[model samples]
Target chain A: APGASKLRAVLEKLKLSRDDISTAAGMVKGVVDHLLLRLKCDSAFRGVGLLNTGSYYEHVKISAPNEFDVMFKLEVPRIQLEEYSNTRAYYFVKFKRNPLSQFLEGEILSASKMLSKFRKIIKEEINDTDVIMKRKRGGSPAVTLLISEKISVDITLALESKSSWPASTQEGLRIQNWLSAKVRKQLRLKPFYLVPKHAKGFQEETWRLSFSHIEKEILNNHGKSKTCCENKEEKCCRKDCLKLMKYLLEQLKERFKDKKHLDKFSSYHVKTAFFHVCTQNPQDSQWDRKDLGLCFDNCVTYFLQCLRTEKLENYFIPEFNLFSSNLIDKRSKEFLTKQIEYERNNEFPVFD
Target chain B: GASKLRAVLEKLKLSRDDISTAAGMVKGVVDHLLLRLKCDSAFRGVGLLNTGSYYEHVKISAPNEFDVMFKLEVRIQLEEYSNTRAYYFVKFKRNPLSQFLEGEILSASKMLSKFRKIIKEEINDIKDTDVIMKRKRGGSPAVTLLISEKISVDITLALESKSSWPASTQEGLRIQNWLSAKVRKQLRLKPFYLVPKHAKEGFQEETWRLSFSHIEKEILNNHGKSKTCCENKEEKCCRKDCLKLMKYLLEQLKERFKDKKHLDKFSSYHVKTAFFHVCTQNPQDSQWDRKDLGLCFDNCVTYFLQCLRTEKLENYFIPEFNLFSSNLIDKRSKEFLTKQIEYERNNEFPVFD
Candidate 1:
């Protein structure tokens, strides 16, 4: 309870300044809107639309409003997904059959080819402005854009699909405890995205399956009762606690900037743990804003438990272990686990 | 001495030396393929069917590319693949063959590869004598060969049948106004051909597409409203000469913007198709006299531009099949190509230079 005040102060620091969000969001949104207009003129990305995702749009962004995640909702003819056979989270997008665009030439849609085309158009169009298209890092699926050499935004190309979720997700999505089956049904009925991401030892055609849209929705309405965060007596700290945990990961990464492994884990892991803890404590009282410290600690504990066992299942896809050797090596998992453990033990000195 | 376009049209025509040498090169390779393939058990009755722009005499530029179809008669029923007239499942009347059987239907990929294998082997039997052949470009079903690094010959195996035209071609060949309805009926009676061309974006690559090359050549020759119009040097209509100029303009624009990639799908066939449309619209031979070559050429180019603007260049033979389809050339590419053409038109056709 005593340290709760200190953690609240940390949350305050994590809050983005109103002026910063105004100017930053305006500029990035302005450029991206223009980018989308330019993209529509391209034959390959003709029907492209924008979808705001990531922490920035989830209202959990911290420190600076200097970064954003946006998806170009590419309109494709109907497509069937083929799982890479090696991973449940990766797929090969194929056409349902059409003589439409030439992009549909091959049986399996090439993710690298589509993304490369998208990247080239963005680079070509953006070079006219002050926004600099950053040289790509090997593992990134995003085309990173630096606005006026200060704020950076990552642009991803995702095929908009209306089909049912794949069989790979049959064992996952255990959301009955946190939300109603009706709610789950509604979410599942909505569309999903397949981002152009490659898995090693596979085709550049491999697409990383995603449902970040659902993730954004759940985080936005994160309360058992609709007014759980609205009514003064029923106020909750679910989002606030999750925000604090993200801030912790961000701080730890900054603290150990020299280590390469630190970059491997991301805010996604922290957010995933927050979802599990939400299900573990479905009641609004469990996440009272007055007890933000305890709620934040509980989220961290669940994450640490996952890391200690070297097994963090993707919240939507249970078969995929985020801490797997293929994704995060055993050494990095252990290193990250110890790094996180040190913070929890020291009342998150990095946050201070 | 003549109009700027007439000079350009004259320049676009194949030179006598290049034409004869290309013929000799084509003959050596085609004859060699026929004699060699005749011996293969799978390729029996593989008669040569000369087709495409070269044979139609609408080809522009050097005689650089040739299309020769290796026609083989097949007694089979054509089953439409998934409502598309462009693709078919070749169902043999009797399925006892050891090869190309998809539970009684002929497989496009198997027959294509089999035919490709023997042809590749036989063509090698050119070292089997150079008019040197190039390496295999597998994405194309054609076995492309280079003659002295100057010419590329595309040889494909097409299935020939005496069946009537496809239902989708019902609304097309509206040449009652141009070549006459009787000519249209007789043309429809001729045997149609299909090639093992895989349609874009489907896993079912085992499909044969309708081949109009054989009949298209016929249309280009009889394009005159009166059969003896081109022959009557007495009344030489600039009908074909208009086509040749339009073909040259596209060729120049293509070379000018070769890096643009949008022009790759565009071909001389496009110019030829629109030429048929224009001739049909102005059916009288009076509209295309040799003395008014420039006006005729302008009319042809204008019709072609409208096609690009509407993004709706229908297959002249099969009206239902749009040649400049959203599937083939995307809208943006169509717009870009449209602007490039208009650019040439505005500049007095600098690409023609």
Candidate 2:
């Protein structure tokens, strides 16, 4: 009884308070609205739109609610996307048919140049507002801004296209086996985005394909049946398992402050692992509401197995191995496994 | 300005007391490790030798790090595993030492893991050892131990053998032009070490890298064509000063770019190796005049920055080994490093400040 009560207490602590949720929501809305107004005035960004993404929008906000991610997407028409020869994830954006805007003429769409200009506009806009813009890092795709110097928001500038997906990603995203083929087709039909990511040995105009919007959609609509996680049906521990995993990863990273070792392990990696685990065990009964602790443990065990083997593939781009060669290295993998084992054996003292 | 350079150099120098204390602790740990090896039926440690920056007397800024090699004499046939030819796999040749090992085939990973366990257990057994064993880093040659959270010692378990150097090193070590042929001959006669560092992908068990730490120490200690280069008989040179400054600059860059993942490939060893190449290029003692410390330091930094920018730093002892193999640093990291160097150069080396 004591153990169960303590576990419940920890889970309760993980939930964001109503006030915290409201404050984050207000900040997101304020920032998005401000950017929308600024975009309307700037001719270059006339057709751009903003979409709220990540865990905060998916109602999966655990820990503190001080961070939010918003995607500033510009839908470009008649654009030709050329895949970079080396890596499957990146592409070079070229304008096949120039737009009416003078800004889009004569020059190809360079990710670095567009990101630099977007960052400058954000800085100028924030100068008039209460928000403080953080220094732009050399290779980061997001323009980080601090709201009242307390909450941090990452505003990523992306290029959306209605073109068909690249050939490299054809055999990937094998979700038809888990979620129905219709759902997979519908999800693929949604517009894909190209974020400003510098690919090595490639042109500076190269960009990486981002599926964050689709990832968010899948997280919200995830279930074996359509009625799963609805008002009348019993809830499962799928989201709870993901939250615990993310919590565990954060604690491990905190314990090992050397960024060199923990740099490859992110919340996205944990989310991807969860998606794979969902596909493996497709039955809703496998993750029953009453067996939260057992389900969480099973999820952790699956994650640990992945870490040990160093075989975490990207959910959307299965050809792209998340643990590619030196990304997660041998030492870091061993260290993380040991840490996870310690936490698991000790009933996850990190959660407390 | 010269006074400022001297002040920075003074700050970078390791104190005698700190060095002595660190050396004493390292000796104590090595003794304990050797004793455990003798007692254990599964392994045996043949010899121990001090190596790396601390032993080479090039250590600066802090006396918190030390390198010592525990030599395990195992008889085996060496096979080149990787294209570099520096990494080799040891095939056991039915010796008495083979009886001490568990498996019929000797695996470098298994041996190192067992050695790590012994050191860990030995540290744990000592009541007041005040030492913490670091997590085993992948592809690292050393079993690191932390003392008092400030000092760290890398205790490497290597297999020492008296044999001719590998073919990969034929065109390497062009020190004969800089140092005496007799001195080079004597240096080559010394034994080499095979550290338990394997390739990341295929044939991991079959690969152990060759370490020339002993040769590196010899070259640093007697670092002159003329016998009295850094001795009292002649004018003191700024050669070592140039090295210390370059090392300090690299240390600063590492701290500034600590959050960036790509810069991890750049290490102080690259700086040291680059310094060796500089010495060979400008072999004359007059080239490194003490009064021109600033000029010499700037030149060394420029040379190193060029290597980083071009992404082609050759290993000093192993010529075929390209230090800047593409995987080590990407285009973004190179650009970041070049910008940092340019900033430092333009700002009159404020990193020392």
Candidate 3:
């Protein structure tokens, strides 16, 4: 509470102006739509809709609103997912019972081949020579391209998995307390997605089981009661808490740039921790705008615990400990834990 | 039926005798073929599907080119072909009883050969020279067993699908204006057919072309927005006759421009597609009056010319497929076809003579 005023100032500064968001959105949208048109016109991808996977484009942009995640939700009949080796988070898509498209030929559907075709079409279809296509960052499912200084988009070709959620997700999605059991059940009925992503150093055709669409839905409303934040009359601070947490992580990442291991720390990590904290304290009252600072501190504490125990389960998959040593190394883990500790103990000078 | 177009329509119309004669031949051939299919252990569930222009009553000339689908309702996995959005490659959901014929994914080349072989042997077994099995056309999906060398019974081996229309077809088969939205939804729910047809362009190994021939036939049979559209004399619509005249025009043009390299790109399917769209464009049954034969013909031909000029005759059932892409057709070819149609229409359709 020592620099609550400074925290407020920093939060305000971190917020994107309406004019900036509009300009960025309008600019980004033109190119996004152009690529989408080209995709729709192609004979290979006729009926597939380009699904906008990420959330809060219309509101609550923490920084400049430029980046977008749109998934090419491909069609598959009933499907079964084989857990990829030890990583319960990754899967191999198998036809449940199915002419099969050659794109999806063989023992299991080739995420690698699907992505290669996806990338190849993107390259050929994007007619603008002026746009710079971001070269392959190994194992990324997105065929990312930079439209200009003002616009960039990450387009992932995701295989649609229309079946019951995998068994691993039974204990996950701890949103029964937050979004309610009925809403949770409704969400579960929806299909999950698999992006053509592989882990580093693995020579395999594996897909990262994704739930971005689910995450977007949860974040968009984020209410126990539909009226909890449906209108400005009963505005909740859940999104504000998320925004602050992401801002804190971004500033910390910027501050600790020289610390090589600190590269693993990101807004995604912040969001996952925020998700965990929300589950732990599911009541909307716990995240009151009046106690924004307290709520922010609580999220930070939970994140530290996740770091110390190295056991922050992925919000969608209980089996996946996102804080595993393979992903976030011991040195970076320790360094990040100590830094957050110092900030919290010292009244979070990073907010200044 | 007094106008020039009406006179032309009469000439193009398939007589009742004509229908019976061809249907009788195909009926016998298909029955024997279906029986033989049952005899083959793997093709036990293979059933016959009567499809194409002739069956739909839009066949202009001889009732020769038939579309018979030897369909087996099997669980299939659908995925877009790697090359194009138009066609998809189908794989069996499970490993089948016969795995050696590349049953995992349905092969256009491999499966079509089985159809051709059976038909050829049927031709041999019958020793009917009048019903000769024609040589395989390079990359054709049909196994053409010609009847009397004048009637070609084009057979396609298609998988009858349980799934909703493939993603590529979401934009297609839009009969919302011509049929009730509820009816259209029901039509969409009807199992789609996917023939073992490779993309005319693109990676052509094992993709299957989605067919709404069954649904198209259903659409043609229903043929109106109102249930009573053609039910009475007062409500009679010339939509079918419009298509017939258009088909007749195209056939004449093809015959006239047989020397031209580009005219074959025009198909009765394209005309049918344009006809379906023009139906939606003018949804009123009154507009396609039995009396407005000439007007309806102009409307249909105009849409066809417009599509040819723009070089974007999208497939009626599969909206993503443009029949006249510059890559598939020359800009010169589109213009040529447009000009030919324009010349014929402007000159009283003497080609229809």
Candidate 4:
């Protein structure tokens, strides 16, 4: 009893509020449960969502330019490559420039589109680079990779105006409104369609969605096919399922060819990556299937990827083949000749 | 330089003492010369004594039974068994037990020697436990195994009792004085005599002879043999040579075996093994003569083996040999048999009362 009293006194001396204590307890619980799930499930949850196979769940700090700085964390998914170790590929929702100082909503929209374009580029890279699809334990073909657990994202959103504006006391608030409207509209589209009706508050700028939607979708599809699980009727539950999650996340990034942005963000900053937690959840499951439903995910990826696409391409500049009659395969040589002609006519430099 | 100073000062209120006032005019000259010397002539001073090979430098802090507490540091040499592991050995001035109780000092050494004899009577544990003259190194017959760089004796002297009726502290002092006298007498008999002549007062609780007279004797003899170094001509000088010094120390210990009191004290509480370092101008040239030095490198091993011998002879606890007749021809098998004999004679029954 005396020892217990001493421990209680120590705890009291910590002077943590009830809410803070609860949050701390919850965080600890989350971490422990995540570890337990990894151990139990083994490799099922790869990529599409929460439990990325290779990477561990980590906390991320966010400090916006104008808004209060707060910390939030999640168990994001990662993809590991044999060459580059394991990469974490997950969804990130950041303010279009700055939600607090809504500057360049249009540019943010453009950025969103750029991400979409890069998604296509990623798929092209996968196909062109001869990327092979690895089969899951008993599921369909996906990217075979490892995941890194130590990495996560931290983002600070700021505003930049393209033109001089009449600065006023309400400038930040006004920008916040514009940014929120743009974000809501952008997210409400088919790819994003993430606004939950009850969580439609522009002022508070807070929302929740199951970040593991992609992972859940892939797994659900896998289950429907009656593949991978031990029994036909048995549902695939968590058990070392993080590997599966990691694999799928890699595939998603590769499918969209949006991996360059992820790499750049992690490389250029000390804090790795950044993302926003939107306050809106899609209205219905159907919304996810439609173009509008997938808008958020697709648009965000497209804009971000396109912005860095040129830089990414420059990193691994393709080598152009010259005609060497004796060594060249006949068909490949002919194709190369045609490409040369086309490039010359277009005034484009040969890769070589 | 001005900009750098300004940058530093801008950060805080600068104190004159903290200023970088010296602008390298006088500093660079000395630093440049020192650097050059370090690069060229560093090995000139490189000898076993000054080499940075770490020995077991022990620091002891102990409080007497009374109010006085003593903290003394001593450098005890270390002998490395392998690259990663080493053992430190110290030679004490007197039997450790003598320093504990006041009147017990006189009989302490004798008591330990008696204990050893008793052990030997009940157990024949000390046979063929001396340093070997030959060793195999990388398939070659090696002559010497350099033990370490340098060795010093580390000891802490503390009066366990201020006043006592049972154990006389004077006896401890007498033994230490006798030891100093013996060393001095030996030095005087040698060709070259060198020793610090000073009588330190107070009880001779602890003292250590880091560099014994033999080491210096060997060096002087070698130098005398060399015309350039001394009158005689010799190829090598053995100033504090680890192997020769250790061998001489062992011979001295063997000669003292007849002293029952000393032997008893040695058997009871004195450390058996010792450590020494070979002083050399070049570290690369220094080496250990594993084959020549053999068991003498660590006297503890020989002592332990002796205990094993005693147990085997007294107990007669022979176990069946596991080796086949053909396999018994191997050296390993012979070694195993020797170990078996030692274990049986030393450990099968009580060796000392």
Candidate 5:
């Protein structure tokens, strides 16, 4: 929907002209085009894909006392997902299509390189100031600004899209196990860290030695020996494994909080860490396998959210590769490959 | 940008029980997917002529109010063309994607079949009136209304983009000549026609006959025998020729309009009727060809205006053929082809000055 107030604000801010509205419209369409392409390629969410054309965007009447409306009708495909039946998830991405790439390049690249080029063009050829003023008067402008500040994406994952399974059935348990594991992964944990000698927080030599010894033990066994309560008849194995994983995640979060080390790593490193911790659990049934799948989804979503909010950056990439190379054993890879193959053959109901 | 006001309207239109706005958003995106496809295709206008996937759309924030104002940005190609240059016209039609087709079938098509089938299957699927009323305060039921309004289409000749000759070219004048001739063929002499037998009180027989009856003879002989002229090269000869042509046009329109009994015979007639007449005899430099070209451009623009305003629908559909057919006596196509080839190889500007 095109808000007159918003349009007015833009016009006033930029001092744009009326004829530039069409150009703005073009920009809006372009932004939509770019985001749609991005989601199609980057995300597993197929339901969010979109296409655009000029006619869909229209200037319509509005009730706002100070404004008119430009409301566009968007058509989307029906989404089917494995949660609540007969429901679909709504996915939203904030971006306009006008000169979208230029903005992205300007933001990501250095000011001297890309921003300089933009400033030069606007200063010399484009009469952006006049264009801004036209837009302020409730008139259209020649060029449209399509880049948005923070884009929000919202999607719902539902259970109804999947075939119904009786509560007591193996598949039902598998799904339940999957969702619980995912929810647990999303919950953030506390922070803790290792301090070296001579650092401000350094403690006594004995204390340091004890912590180092514990760390060595942890490092030697790769955190696997932390738990061993696998009894088939008891269902204790699943519970124990989940509890240990949750504890470890919390410990990692606590140790890394407010530390610049994580920020220095790349996203790939973060995911690799997650995968390393995640794939360690034994897969005895379809239920356990489903839990692992949901865990992977949850971790990725959180990682992406962190990146968007600038909560984490820079550090995860290299660490991600390191963790992946070290922890992703042949057997684990085989299991993941089988799961991927299974998903390929079976339609995984897309969550928008 | 989404705002409080829009959020309110969206909330009013959609409710939690009725339909989640989030779900609506998803549905809307899917429905509009095809339009996005078309917009992407438009990137070809930038002259790259190749499809790219790295393209993205973003919002542009004003420099000062970086937090507030923004517009949707699309990174795509921009295309422009010059009228003087001749180019090949490649035709294409839009094809709906699979999801859209399937959706139309499941929703629109099913509801449009037999009325009883529609009412029974669709209506019965809903709850009773009371249930609908219970939810009425929040919003109206999202019922699909089946309308039976008739629709018709109108079409008219359009200048194929960039096909017109430039303002001052001889080819442009030729196009003008052709269009004026076409329009003259269709216009009526009198606003309303009167029958010869039941003529009005003030109507004179000789005047009526002059206007309608002897038009054929006047046209064929160019009125040369009836009207005296100094010589074939004289201005009087051209004036007489125009008058004869105009009289022939009036008679043709009259017969076509008033004499419906002979319509079939008229359709089979060998000679084509004239529209309006346009004369161009400017003897300026041949290099510019300004007068003729400008005239043709004017005719095309006028034709477009007429097509838009006229009530007749069939005129809109008829494809306006090019000024000259592929087959012409002078082998003009070959000449034009050679001119294009030479201009391309030499990088010489081909536009008429």
Candidate 6:
């Protein structure tokens, strides 16, 4: 009972303050709008537009309201995209013919070149503002910027293609069984994106698939039944469970500072695991708001099982295993499992 | 470029004398291990079987790596440890081998550690031995031995169970259409092996996984739709050649991007498995013309690239074993492989040089 009370108290503390959320939202919009205008004026980024995604926009931001993820997408036509390698998640984007955009004609869309260009523009645009461009890290897809020495925003340059999804992803999106065939079909009709992702020794033009838009939509409207989380019905603890999982992982990372292997483990993995759990137990009654503690425990148990097996299938992409062999070794897995078990048995004292 | 290909192939090929010498040395080690196990208080029913690429003749470059499974015949019940059905925990049905173990439930890790200790002592006692036991790698099922600092022998302690294969592997061996249902049946009749594989985190005794070395050896040896493939009466094919080229290309990529962390996950096994799938898709003998070495090699590389780009290389024998699923080979590695393929195609492969 004390454990439940403490967890409830911690959840209350995890809520973002209205002022902080409003401030972050205003700054993110201003920065995104400014970049969009500049990008649209440039012939190379003519069709580029903006889309708000990530935990902040999806209403799943549990810790702080400082982090924002925005996609700057450009629509392209008749582009020849080839698989970059055996890892089915990346691609080489080349124009089959002139894309009609004068600046991009005959030029392969290189992720690094475009990213640097976007980074330079952001640096110039944000020079007068509190927003400061962070130093670009190698192979990172996002051009990250820090605002007011506090808020962080990741600006991802993406290419929107109307082409059919890759064959590798044919068996993916196994949510049709849970979310219904109609919803799955509607989700499939949405445009896919390729973000500028640089790989070492490879040509600068390679891109990796990004389904953040879909991920956001799923999180926002995640329910087996339409009325499940509506005003008329009982509220489910899906999001609450996710927030707790993310918080638990963060605390574990902080406590086990010497465990470098735990560094690869992220809140994203926890989020992905939550999505899978939702799909597996699709009944809304199963995750009743009153049974928040029990539901959260079940989710944690499922996550622990995934860790033990080292096989967390990416919710959208079946071909992508989040827990790869080398990403998390046996020792780190054991450590996390033990720590989580301790928290569960001790009413998650880490939150306290 | 043609000359470069020839030169590279020549360099990659192992000489007969070198092969025989390495085989002899490996045999000596195996004999010593078997003898030691037979006489030791802690080991019984242990049998030695030489397995892996070297035994299958797909080994290239040199005879520097060897795999020998130290199999223990035991009557045991395998409890499925994971949903994947690839891993299991063994429970002894009888107490015949209990003297060698500590508990009623068999611990693969404990057996492997004890086995490694025995080998270490045996090798240490030998007066003029170049063999030295290497430290155990995390998650690796094998106990490795460094031979003369030139060769590495993976001595895996395996539990051989004469039981039905896991259900997950039933639909995966898509090779039945190519290798014939009869041959597939015969291959399945063989005993399955469980080695000391590490499960991420769980029960300490539940870290053993099914090993397919025996099955791999079978497929490689009888690699054809027709039984007469690679026989004296049949024409020579470039299947093996293509495999070697792909392996060499991967090795070269590893060397070129030695500093890059993304390529660390790409192993030669991926290339080898891809070759098997390619063989299944294009079963006709004409597809692998020995004279068209360059063309065949390019085709194999293209197939591999296509699989990588699509990110779906299913394990030949285990359909559920999606090689591309693990984020080992990330987008960067994929892009690098694409550039390397194009460069090799356009410039006669300066990579080999």
Candidate number with greatest lDDT: 1
Once model 2 is optimally superposed onto the true structure by TM-score, how far is the C-alpha of residue A23 displaced, in angstroms?
98
Interface RMSD of each: 35.9, 36.3, 19.6, 46.2, 46.8, 22.9
lDDT of 6 by residue, A161-216 (tens): 88777776787777755565555766888888888665445555667787889888
In model 6, which runs have C-alpha deviations exceeding 4 angstroms?
Answer: A16-18, A99-108, A128-141, A199-205, B1-353
For residues A1-352, write the lDDT of model 2, one tens digit per residue.
1243545676688763757877866976887788778876777787888766778877777755777767788877767777787577877777765443444424557665676678778777777135443333323445776776577777777788887776777776766655655557767888888887775543566788888888887677666443356534436777877877887888778878866688667888889899999888866778787778787778888888888878888777777777766466878778788889998888778768
Q: Write the residue-wise lDDT of candidate 5 on A1-352 in tens digits.
A: 2222332342243333333444544554455455444443422223333322111121110111111112111222221112112111111111222222342333221112222332233223322112121122111111222134322111111111112221212221111122222222221121111111111132111000001121222222121111112223212223322322233233333455675433234323342333333333322242242244444344444443433333321121121123232323444333333433343234221110
True contacts kept of 1: 0.00
Evaluation by lDDT, superior candidate among 3 and 5: 3
Q: Give lDDT: candidate 1, residue A229.
A: 54
Clash list (residue pairs), candidate 1: A100-B327, B125-B128, B126-B129
Quote model 6's iRMS.
22.9
After superposition, candidate 3 runs with Cα above 4 Å error: A55-60, A97-100, A128-138, A230-233, B1-353
Name the runs in model 5 displaced over 4 angstroms: A1-243, A249-282, A285-320, A323-352, B1-353
Q: For model 4, how does the per-residue alpha-carbon lDDT over B157-218 read when each residue is reduced to its tens digit?
A: 11121112111111211111211333333333432111111112312212211112232323
Please tell me which model should have the higher TM-score, number 2 or number 5: 2
Using lDDT as the yardstick, the better of models 1 and 5 is 1
Name the 10 consecutive residues with the lowest summed lDDT in model 6 chain B: B225-234
Residues B23-62 of candidate 3 have per-residue lDDT tens digits of: 7787787788788877766576789777777678677766
Q: On a 0 to 1 DockQ scale, where is model 2?
A: 0.00
Q: After TM-score superposition, what is the CA distance of residue B318 in candidate 3 from its true location, in Å? A: 39
Each prediction's Cα lDDT score? 0.74, 0.72, 0.71, 0.23, 0.24, 0.73
lDDT of the structure predicted as candidate 4: 0.23
State the lDDT of candidate 2 residue by residue for B151-269, as single tens digits.
Answer: 67777777887777777877778775566444566677888788877576633644688888888877787675444456443447888777777787878778877887756767788
The TM-scores that each candidate's chain B achieves against the reference are 0.91, 0.90, 0.91, 0.17, 0.17, 0.89
For all predictions, the C-alpha RMSD in Å is: 27.3, 30.6, 19.2, 34.2, 34.8, 30.3
- Candidate 3 C-alpha lDDT tens digits along A1-352: 4555656786677664657666766766777677767776756565456655564442556764666555777666777778877787888778757433666757787766666666777787775324333445434545666766656666677767678888878888887656655557778999887777776657457878788788877777565533455345445678877877777677788887876768877677777887778778866667677677777777788888889898888888888888888888888889888888998788777777
lDDT of 5 by residue, B130-199 (tens): 1111121111111222211211111000111222222222222221122232222322221111111111
